[model samples]
Structures are given as structure tokens and as C-alpha cells.
Target: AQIGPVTDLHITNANISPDGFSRPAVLAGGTFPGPTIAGNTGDNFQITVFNDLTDPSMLTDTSIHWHGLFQKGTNWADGPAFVTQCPIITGQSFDYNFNVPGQAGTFWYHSHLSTQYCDGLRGPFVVYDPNDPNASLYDVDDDTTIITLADWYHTLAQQEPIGAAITADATLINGLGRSFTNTTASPLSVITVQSGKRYRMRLVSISCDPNYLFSIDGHDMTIIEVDGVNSQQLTVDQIQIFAAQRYSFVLNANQPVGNYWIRAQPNSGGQGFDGGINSAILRYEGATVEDPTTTAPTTFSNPLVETDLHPLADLGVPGQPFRGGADDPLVLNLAFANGRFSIDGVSFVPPTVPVLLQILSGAQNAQDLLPAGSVISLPSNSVIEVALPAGAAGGPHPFHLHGHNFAVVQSANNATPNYVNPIWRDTVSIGGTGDNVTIRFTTNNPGPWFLHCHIDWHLEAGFAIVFAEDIPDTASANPVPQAWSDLCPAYDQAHNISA
Candidate 1:
């Protein structure tokens, strides 16, 4: 039941309200949460993106990133502005042609340029497996079960006052919610369920900031997938989902036919959920339309701890039994001062030339790359370990790496090394003071991959770096298309930006 291999996506600006406050947003297909784009594994995808923006406030230039997709030999199609390719300017169109060859799971698409996704440019991207291992666990597995949690702001994204506390005016559940202040609830999204059936609910947190504690009032969730990787089913009452993370849980409708509350409590800057700021309803097939009057327990009996999870497959750590002994051992010190964040000793800023394009144009060394302080090259086919120690002052930060999934060698708040088998994921949260988060992966994918904090505000505050892996062979590995060669010259000429 999937569509053709080709799809046309239009990025435009519009005025709409997600939480009762009307404001302008950069929308895809003119909807808050853009339409779900789906296909099967190993299918070639030719997606045409048309930039039809007229508003300058939201920044007309844009780039789209396929979150959780490994762009094996087509790094040019990996859309990160100044990292992979230049942004498609207003009124221009670009083709992102890539193949989904060994990946099938829950994923998403969002703007990767300058916090543009904060203004409502995001959607779900799912790749189905013809022979999924857990196909017997769910009765239904389609697009209708995809859920998105987003934070809405009353003010436009580009107009936010610098150095001010970033907070959301409302928390949206599938593009509808009530304002946090006045409390006029918008139309709520309801999920229907049949008794005695099982469902695979794919929950995605697309928020720019804020980590959500997600749960259903009277039910326990069996998590079977994390960040597109299958995991052993672990039952828990609630899950702490950070930004840009995805999870698939099995839901059983065994209880008597009734309605229950689906809650997403945003831990914004360490402040917990207010009086039902973000909520939805999960109703049975024959249940009444009224909202559930259920309440959460006084204390959580069993909460989700990330360290307790394990991979479904026998995936052991790469290259060694413990920390150290990596081909490249890096210690990144995260810090924030004077309204900016830094990694190691330098902050990140977009380079004039696209990193991939620069390499193709014959820059062979990381030291020769522009923005010298932000790029680090890695040895090909060797294990790489990065230790992100907590900064001088800040809370837990979720860090994400592109192009590969890694093993959690040392997780936050736990010093015991899981050298045998740890959960493989693309994103992990680094804990607070006195804690260090370490991850290890083999550099098999040769290209310029991005390493950065997933928080939108933090990313804008210059908390990011680039991983230039196998610099000597990236150009030869990824052959650039003619259209890819035309992006930089066209973008640079029209926008007066040098590259």
C-alpha cells in the first residue's frame, strides 16, 4: 500500500494556530505535522523539494534532513546546510535522490538549517520491512499509528530575544493542544483501539527543546524499538523521551472498553508539566467521546531507565572489551558562557563552503578545512570513542551522531561499562555534573557526518562539530550528481553568500 518511488514536497510559509495562538510557520504541505512519507526497504527515493517561501522572518533558505537514515554512498543527498549541501533558496527546487538499503523502522524528516524546524517544518518518515522480525507482535502496522509530540511558541522563531530563557507557549500533541496560560483547549487527537488487539504505537518527540515524560494513565507500555533499532520488549509505566528520539511500544487493549488519558509532561529547563499542559485521549472502539478522568499514581512503581535496555540482536561492542584503545579517543568538553556554547575550545558556525563539496573540490586534510577548530577527521575502519564530560554548568543534554549507530560504552549516571552488549542507538543523553557519557563506533561510513546536541536552542548557541571521516577517500566514495554540483553556485550567487 505504499506510494511510488517519487514524491514532490513543497516547503511554504503560512499563518496558523496550533495552540490557539495564530502565528506564521514554515510548513511542509501546509500542515502542522507534515504528511507521512513511507516506502519499503531497498527502494530508491526521489524526493523533490520546492521552496516556496515568501516570509523572510522564518528564513527562506532551507535544507531537509532524513533523520536516522544512513546515506551510504549518497552523502550529497544528506541535507545539512553547509555540512552536506547548501540550502535550497526560495523559489528553487532540489532533488534528494537516495536509496533506503538496509534500514527499516520509525524515522522522521525535519529542517536542519538554523533552527528552522522550530517553526513547524517536520513530519514522520517510516520505512517498512517486508520481513520484519516482530511482525507477529502487532495487529496493525501502518501510518495511522504514528504520533508526534511538539512544542509550540507564540512568537516567531527568528524573532526570539537573544539570551532570554527559551520556553514554549503550549505543548502540542499531534498538532492540537491548549494554551498554557489561558487554557482554551484546541481540538484533541484521539486514537481508537479495539479490545483484545495489540498495536504498535510509534511515538516521536520532534520538539526543539524539552524532554517529555510520556505515558498513558492506566496502562503500561512494552517498548520494542528505540531509535529505529529493535530492542527486547521492556515494560514500564513511563518513558523519558528526549528530543529527536523515537520509540515503538506495544499496546494491549485488554482492559475493559473505556477511555484513558495520554500524557506528555515536558520537563522544560527542569520544570515539570503544569496542570495538563500537553494531553490527548486514547479511546476504545465503543467508548464515549468524553475525555478520561483518570489520574496518575502518587508514585511511579517502575520507571524507564535507559541503562536497563538491551538490543534484541546479539550486537557486541566494537574492537575492545572496555573504554580506551580506540583508534581515535576524543574528550569533548561542553561549556556555556557569555550567551554561547562551545565544544572543546571552539564554537560551531556554518562554513561558507559545504564540507562535502569542499572535500570534493580537493581539500584533503581536516586542518585545511575552513572553520578549523570545529572539524575532526577519523581513521577509516577503526573504532572511535568520544567522551562528553559535563560542562561547567548545565542540565542533561541529548547528543546525536549522524551516519552510524553506536554502542553505549558508558552511560550517564552509570560507570559500569557494558562492554559485552549495550543497546545500539543514534542518540543518548549525557547526564549532569560528575557524569560522563561515552560512545564507540567503527568508522565504516566514509563522509562528513555531523555531531551535535539535538536541542534546537543549544544548536543555535553553537553547540556542534563536524566529523570528517576518511577524508582522503570521501570524494571518490560519494560520486556527486550534476544537480548536486549546481546547488552551491546557484545558492551562492542568488543569496550573495560565498562558498
Candidate 2:
């Protein structure tokens, strides 16, 4: 189905073999990774999501989130379950009508309710630039260049024990890889390139858990974009990508024509992958179709450093030179205990009434809203900085903020502030223990936006908070549509806890 600006997505259950193992997946448009929905910078998107799921084990109700779009005036379509609108119940549908007003780049859509995305409701959503400044850097810019790295599990998403350390049965590169223990392998996905052409490879991580160390065996990558924002081209041999992050790099196929391995080594801190368990092939035109005999370098000459990245454009810091001084400075403490995660002493349990609906119904302050202490209010049009000190007993966490991208003023492991020029992106890594990750942004968009750890498992453990930006002005700024207003009533009636 060739859907342009408008499309109909049917969410249902089916059994398929992404790796060699057969399992049930909740898919969209009958595909494992779903479909890539594309548009220009500023376009109206109307996606009608139909919930046809009947597997009681997987929960028939669902909601979809546009990963990195700033829903300026349409916060109702932002798609977090309790933060925006409720889930579309079984046999029902909801229209996500929103405009991508003043932004573009690599984004994605996936199931936002509970741990549903791990069951396979994730896909790529890209916004092309007609007059892109980086257009001259590459020869190809199409769907064929999009590469997704994911972790596949044999256990169903809903069946996993909450708060347990989960591991994938197989690491999939474009939905194909060898099992860790089994010597037999499935047919790997291949990316074919011509010998003399330069291609733009848009790398996306749709991972539920584990950050990946991604690299090509025989070539270096010139990174041009990070998390949908353009960056000054920085070349690297390998990149460490956390969950829900993206990077677009230029690959010049100037080497001798041959098959090389495209490796995505999962970094579970101390865990290791079996020989060739997480690998794919990159075939140059006229190269033989066989497994690559190439070997990876023992040490990377130009490894990726997060602090070294700077914006291609001059996106200066929003307000003061440092993060400690802001209209609103928040210091959040992350903790985990007793099978749940907490931010500032509050474990976020979804409120019965959606936060946006409550605001539209004339609730002024965050304290007056449901699930009281979890919602924070930010002053209107002010510069804000949030300090996330890391000691959370897990690996480095990638913290993501919806509705606004921020400057990584003080990244993890770097104490000196980069008031001059820091990379501005939607998500950033809060490094290991004793690290403080601070971000600065101007609050121009008004609505309840979610700030949370991007790890699907951590989010389900309640490591999140709702930012009610300009709360008094939100109800007036975002006028809810009739379809959005009808979600709660429909969901409340059709949902059943007893599966």
C-alpha cells in the first residue's frame, strides 16, 4: 500500500520468522518492521490507526507515538498513553492528525502503550528536505538506505517478568541474524552498493534493550546527522548508538569491490555475543554473494566521542552560558528498588484521566492534575535546564524529551560546560555512575510533554515524569479535536484486565 500523506494502519497479530525462530508479533501493514512513512519538512499527516488485535495475551488496545515530532498545536496526537490521549480500544480506531510545522529529519512511530513495541509495532518515519544543504554529499537518498538495528526475543513482551534484566535471544540487523547458540544461520539482509557511488546510510536503533556498537569492516563513516538534527560531518570507525537514537552517515564505496561485514555488536556492558551471531553483509556490485571474510580492527582509530559532535548550523545555547542558571533548574534523582523505578521519589503510575484532557477541562496547575507530584510545571518561554545525575544501578541510560530538542551543555563524563557550541538533539546518554548529564532548552512549546528513559524496559518500570509547560496557556494553545476527546470514553468501556 502506497500511502502518501494519509494512510490506514491495521494493527493485528501474526506468526513470523524474523530470525530462524517462529514467534507471534503484533505488526502493522503485515510486516515485521512495519513501513516507512515519509513526507517533506512541513506537511500534514493523517494516519488512521485501526486496532484489529484479538490476542488477549498481547492486549488488543494500543497507541502509537511519533518518536521525534514537535506536535506544536496538536499535543493530543503526540501519543503517550496517559500523557496525551488514551489507547484506541479493540475494534475501534483513532485518527492521528498533526502537522510537522517547522522541523524535519529521521523519526519513527511505534506502539507507546506498555511494552507493546517489543512485540513489533515499530517502523521508520522520515522527513525529506527539498533544499537540503547536505544533499550534495551523497548520490542516494531513498528507502533502501535506511538500516534498523533491533534485538529479537523468543519470549513474548507481555509475558516477561517486570523489572527483570532481559536479554535478547538474537540480535537482528534488518530483521535477520544467527542465533547465539545455534551454529545454523538464517539468510542475512544485504545492502548492495556500486563501486564508485557515495550513499547516505540512515541508521536507526529500534532496540528494546542494549546499546549497539555499529561499524562497517572496511570503511569509515562521515556522520552528517544525529537524532534528526544535522551535524558538522565527523568521521568515525564505529558508533555507539543507544535505544531510540538515529544517525545518518556518508559511505563512499571507493575500496576494491568485495563483500564486507556490517557488524552491530550489542553492548550489554559485560555480556558478549557468540561468533558471528550479530552480523550482516554489505555487498559491492559484482562482488560474490558469500559471507564476508573481512576481520574487524582490534582498536578503533577514530572512535565516536559524544562531546566531539557539534551542530552543522549555528544553534546557540538558549540562555545563560551554563546549566545551573535558568528560569527553571531541575535536579532529578533516579532510583530503582522493589521492582520499580522512581524519579524524584515518585513512581509514575498512569492517571485515569489523561493529563491533556484534564488541562483542557480547566485544571490550571500541575498539583491540581491527577497523579499529582509526577507532573512538573515550566514557566512559559523561559530557558530550562535539567540535571540528571547518574547512579541508577543500570548501564548508561539515554534520556529523551518529547516536543523539544535541547543542547547537550554538560554531557556525561565531561565536567566543563560547552557554552560555545554543543550538539543539539532530542535524546542524550546519561553515562555511568558519578556522571551528570545536563541539558538546556527554551520552552516555547506549550503542553504536557513526557521526559523519560528511552529504554522500553526502564519506561515500563516507571522511570518517567510529565512536564506541563506553560500549564495555564496549554488549554488555550492546544484545542482538542473531537476524535481525541472520544478516546477515553471508548477505552474505558472496552478494556479488560483479565486476559
Candidate 3:
């Protein structure tokens, strides 16, 4: 039972000295890998943040956003400066309080203050369940691995405090930076296990920029969940990850139970690029740390191909309410054009009120095997369906929605195919062509929310939607203000003039 607002203290600039990078950096608690907060499911969490910086004038204002948490009463808790609340001024602190509800999963917290995430103000926050059915699924004589997929900036000059920087170097797997390439005191992550046993690896991509395509060197791992939501298992050669996303896999310790390599490197072929692969060894109990056996490269080319993975339409499994199409639901084609993306010719915007999401009879829940009326609201117990058509122009987009996790129903533009790997997730990848892919989630968490492509540039470019979860009559039926309601149309004239 966690109570009271957790103190979130920030300092101006501290020494972020690892292998190759050294400079003045601002962090949540004056350290990389801030602090891990552990709690039980269904507890209420409260966070109070304080900014303490003097030298940098812009440091006068800072904030912290706890990703994946459902907030109530105050938009100020969201931590999106200028979006929900006024920026926290220097020597000022803001308090964020919310309920964890009854859902249990792996999550992390970071400074949402500008581009400050890259400086090392992040850490894991795990919630345990006493009676969770899947609790005994893993062979847990030995514990599992919690890999923090963080990005290390080699110099302060590389960091953009105002959120303007386009790219960076110095990537990492866990908290250990790129120094794993050198072998000596490289700060590599290691997973110790018993021979013939199994261990779970919970991974997070905390990078504010790079999107990675990762693979385990010797084992074909089973992806159990994504962004803390569980779903069907699908074994694949590898997986692609985006910033602010998380994935968990279980590896059976059948390989003589000795040390092995796990790699998290960037996916090279994309509009914006960040590249580097770092690692940690999986070890057995009593196993001795040995010299490097994997490729320790300073720089390497991405081996991912656009065609090797599964086709569109097959990305989501059958019998699911949202993927295979149980009912003919209303389908809105979110298209990309003139540098921005939209749904049925309209871009998304944040509003003070909830928006009603209409679902036609043709739109089906990929999991239910029922009709559109069977399930209309999003829920954690079941998923609501949404799909993009093929021929969508862009790279593999990370599709995300607040309050629920969905399965990847298909790929680029294949007419008929099952999901390549039927894994449950909060964010699904829209293949290079921005193909037609379907996903299913529930409106279980009752609150106004957002659904969008996780690509920061695309998000900034307008691939976003507002989900009004169970709005009451007082809030939904009230007359809207003329001023704020006209913002999207105003922005549309400016950004979508060519569309």
C-alpha cells in the first residue's frame, strides 16, 4: 500500500560519467537509473516533483510524467508542459496523485520535462500481485532480469534541453552504456540462472530518440507481454522496439546454462536514425564471467530487411475480437499525407472535453468473435478494434493507445495472413509501408485518453486521437467553448493546408 506524494527532486547539472561520456547533466534524483519503486496492485500513487536548478536559465521550469499511469482529477499530473499545466518554475514543486487500480504490470517513470529524459532521469516501477494466476508460469528458482533500455549521451553538447535535437550516439542495453564493446569494466548486464531452468527478461526502451530492433544471440525467446499487458505468445527471429516502449520475454535455460549474449541495437533503415547495440551476458549459478564471444563493434550496419517478417493482415491472430473481424465494424482509414497523418482527412487535437468515438457495424473486436454491439468501450478484460489500411506512406510506425494494450493483427498490405507473432501489446508496429494492421483493447480504465503513433516526430506531425472513456452526461452533454473548440481547425489550416 503506497501513500503520500512521492518526492521527485531535480538538480541543475551533475556529472554523468560512464565509459566515454562526461558532462553536466540534469536528472530526476541526481543519478542515472534514478530509483526503482515497488508496490502491490490497486494502490494509489502520489508523486511530488521539485525543480532545483540555477545556472541554466531554461532550467527555471521542469516536470516529471509517469508513463502508463491513469490520472484522475488533475491534468497537471500528466507532466506535459504547456499541454496540461503550467511548467514547474525554479524552486517550485508540483504534486501528482492517481490510482493504480487493480491492474498489475511492469512500468517506469522519467522526467517528461523537455528533452531531459536523455540525461538519465529514469527508472523502473514494478507492481506485484498476490493472487495473479500467471504468477507461477516462470521457473523462478533464480530471479529474472530487469533490463532498462536507456540511451547514454557521451557529452552535454549532444543533449537538446528544449526538445530540438534530431539525433544522438552512445546507446545502451541496461544502464550500462556502449562501453560493453571494450570488455574491461564495460558495465555489461548479466543474467545468472540454473542449468535447464528458465528466466524472464523485462526490457524497457527509455531512449528519447532511437528505435531498436533486438535479438537474443542463442535463444528463441517467447514474448509474453508488451508495455505490461499479457497476450498470446508468438516466437519470432527478433523484435523491433520504439522509444518509451517495453517488452518482456521468457528464455528457457537449456543452453548448458552458461553465459550468453542479449543485444539491443537500433533499426537502421528509417526516416530518422539512431544506431548502436549493447549487451549483457546470461549466466548460470557459479558460472564465471568470461571474455567477450559476441561481436563487440564500435559501429555496425542494421541487418533488418523490410520483407523478411510476416505480411499485413496476418499480424493479428484469428478468433480475436479486433483482428480477424468478427463483426463488420466501422473502419476509419488513418492516412499519411504532406508530412502529416490523419483519420478520414482530419488530424487529432487535445480538447478539454471527451470526444465520442463512433464504431460502425463493420468494425469488429478482434478477440470477441461477436458483433460491434457486443463490445463498444475499451477494456483490459477485452480489446476494442482499430485497423489501418495498406499503402500508408512512412516507416514502421509504433501505434499506441492510452488505457489499454492491443495485439498486432497484421503487417504492411498482405490481403490475408495471420499475425507473424501473436503477442499482446500496448503498442504495435505499422510496417515500413504503414500497412493495414489491426489491434484490440478495452476501455477498462474509465478516463479521457489518447491513441497515437509513438514516433515522436509523427506524434508531433499529427498522428494522434482522443479517447473519451465513459464520459458522464454533465461532461459530455455540456456546450463546449467556442475558443478552445476551434483550435484543431486553426492548427489544421496551418499544418494541414496541403492535405
Q: RMSD per prediction, one decimal? A: 1.6, 2.0, 9.4
| Backbone N/Cα/C clashes per model | 0, 0, 33
Query: What ranking emerges by lDDT with the best candidate at the front?
Result: 2, 1, 3
lDDT of 1 by residue, 293-366 (tens): 88888787778888878988898888667568687888898988887789988889889998998888899899
lDDT of 2 by residue, 1-499 (tens): 3354688889999997877888999998788788888889898999999999989677788999999999998899999998998899988888898888767788888899988999999888898898888999999978888899888888898999765767887778877877765536677889989999999999999988789999999999999999988999999999999899999999999888999999898876224434567888899999988888998898988988888899999998877785577888889998888877899999888888889988888888988987778898899989999999888866588899999899988887877778878898888889878888889999899999999998888898888999999998898789888888889887876663321
Candidate 2: list runs displaced more than 4 Å.
Answer: 162-164, 269-275, 496-499
lDDT of 3 by residue, 1-499 (tens): 2223344455456776554556666666656676655566777665666667654622444656666665543333555432333345566555565667745666777664444556666767666566644455566621246777666654343234443444445556555555423323545666666777666667677765567766666666666556776534545546667777775666677766456676766653222211223555666776667733544234333333223333212344434433445332335566787766776566554321113212111222322212111123333333355776545554566676655555555544454434445455566666655456666545444443556666554565566654444443213322333322333344344334321
TM-score attained by model 1: 0.97
Worst 10 residues of 3 by lDDT: 352-361
* Model 3: CA > 4 A from native: 1-12, 53-60, 72-76, 139-144, 153-165, 179-186, 194-197, 232-237, 269-277, 294-385, 389-394, 407-424, 442-447, 460-463, 468-499
The reply for model 1, stretches above 4 Å from the true place, is 1-5, 269-276, 392-394
Of candidates 2 and 1, the better by lDDT: 2
Rank by TM-score, highest first. Answer: 1, 2, 3
- Of 1 and 3, the candidate ahead on lDDT is 1
**Angstrom error at residue 110, model 1:** 0.4
Cα miss at 170, model 2 (Å)? 1.2
